Amino acid sequence: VMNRLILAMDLMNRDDALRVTGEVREYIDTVKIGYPLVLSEGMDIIAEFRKRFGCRIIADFKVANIPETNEKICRATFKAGADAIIVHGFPGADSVRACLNVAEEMGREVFLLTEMSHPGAEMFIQGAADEIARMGVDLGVKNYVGPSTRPERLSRLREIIGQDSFLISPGVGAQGGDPGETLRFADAIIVGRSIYLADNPAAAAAGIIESIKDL
Amino acid sequence: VMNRLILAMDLMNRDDALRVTGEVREYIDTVKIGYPLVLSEGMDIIAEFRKRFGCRIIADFKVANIPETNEKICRATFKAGADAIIVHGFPGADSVRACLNVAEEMGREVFLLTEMSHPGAEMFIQGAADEIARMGVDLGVKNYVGPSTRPERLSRLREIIGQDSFLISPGVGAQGGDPGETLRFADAIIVGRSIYLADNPAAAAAGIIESIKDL
Numbered sequence A, B: 001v002m003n004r005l006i007l008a009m010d011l012m013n014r015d016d017a018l019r020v021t022g023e024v025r026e027y028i029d030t031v032k033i034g035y036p037l038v039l040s041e042g043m044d045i046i047a048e049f050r051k052r053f054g055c056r057i058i059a060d061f062k063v064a065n066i067p068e069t070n071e072k073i074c075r076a077t078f079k080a081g082a083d084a085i086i087v088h089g090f091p092g093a094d095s096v097r098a099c100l101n102v103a104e105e106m107g108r109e110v111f112l113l114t115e116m117s118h119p120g121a122e123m124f125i126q127g128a129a130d131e132i133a134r135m136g137v138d139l140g141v142k143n144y145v146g147p148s149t150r151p152e153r154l155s156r157l158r159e160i161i162g163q164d165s166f167l168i169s170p171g172v173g174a175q176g177g178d179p180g181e182t183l184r185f186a187d188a189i190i191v192g193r194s195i196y197l198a199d200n201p202a203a204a205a206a207g208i209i210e211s212i213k214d215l
């Protein structure tokens, strides 16, 4: 990932999403697109971003249904041009395997979400997160998501998945996480509001990158 | 819900989804639409179904992100015309409250998913499900989803949420659940493939209803 920085593009308007992404494209070549933008503007937005910006697209679709439904969601998402899809591990191994099978068929990637960054993640997810990570390892998952807001958890996750696995981390900036600290454990950070709600998104991205280079 | 039967419309083609829903509309006035259809045909499909069939629409969007993102997803979903949205409880109380707040603002409903119907639900969700249900009760949730495939779990869920709460249940037919047994505890059953992959969906729906009337 260019500059170890992934833009979370959660603006809900195509014009604003295209403006901001264009402004920060010199700094960022991977964009995470989720349901706020896709449900507002359509799945065609993924191929539009890929063509216009030449970026990789990670679909943050928190996939979390039964295996048969997960299959259909993954196939629609890869058909739309996404490079990778973020999948919850909490629904269990069969739900994750369904996504892995479609990614294998379509030459794409799954990122396994093992612990979330928000306060409510402490209630149920955190207690299962180590086991979710170990399940990922046993399924052959190579790409993971864990929380910038809890670097001790992010260290434990890294310990389980090993150094070869790729780990990306949201919760930097708005949610309280720090770029440098998070990059002690994660390969890349995800940043949304700190960039896309800034008066100058390019300056916000550049400031983050400057602090990343220093590491 | 008419005949206590909710159609899970997970066909991915607008023409096929419209045909099947039209064929079974005399039996069913509530349709659950999820991401397989929405990601393939667009969010406009929700208002199209509402207008053409005059049905209620439950969006099975398994909402499972951080509170801020859940807010945006719920607002886009209700803007598109959905009557209700299914929300995972596993991400914790703040993630659920975010959905409840948007539903309150927009005069809509949240259904809390507490335990899932597939085999993988045993790994992590089942152990948290009673607590997820109790969290729902303490947040004032009145609508719940629980699994036809485990009627003893569905009985325990009903026990926690009480008799006034509304409980709907997937996993009937294809996944192995039984209509009559499930309706001992749930107010309505959700049925997808047993109807929409049948040679005669209307006959399949009618057969299910005939077994429901007998109760």
Ligand SMILES: Nc1cc(=O)[nH]c(=O)n1[C@@H]1O[C@H](COP(=O)(O)O)[C@@H](O)[C@H]1O
Binding pocket: A008, A009, A010, A034, A060, A086, A113, A115, A116, A117, A118, A145, A146, A147, A170, A171, A172, A173, A174, A175, A190, A191, A192, A193, A194, B065, B066, B069
């Ligand atoms: N996928 C996620 C998993 C997670 O644990 N936390 C999280 O924030 N996200 C997403 O990352 C982004 C964080 O954006 P921000 O807090 O930097 O605005 C948003 O798109 C969230 O939905």
Ligand SMILES: Nc1cc(=O)[nH]c(=O)n1[C@@H]1O[C@H](COP(=O)(O)O)[C@@H](O)[C@H]1O
Binding pocket: A065, A066, A069, B008, B009, B010, B034, B060, B086, B113, B115, B116, B117, B118, B145, B146, B147, B170, B171, B172, B173, B174, B175, B190, B191, B192, B193, B194
């Ligand atoms: N929302 C769900 C929660 C759940 O626990 N199980 C489940 O099957 N569903 C959904 O219900 C429907 C079951 O359809 P079928 O098994 O009758 O085809 C599908 O849309 C699933 O995604």
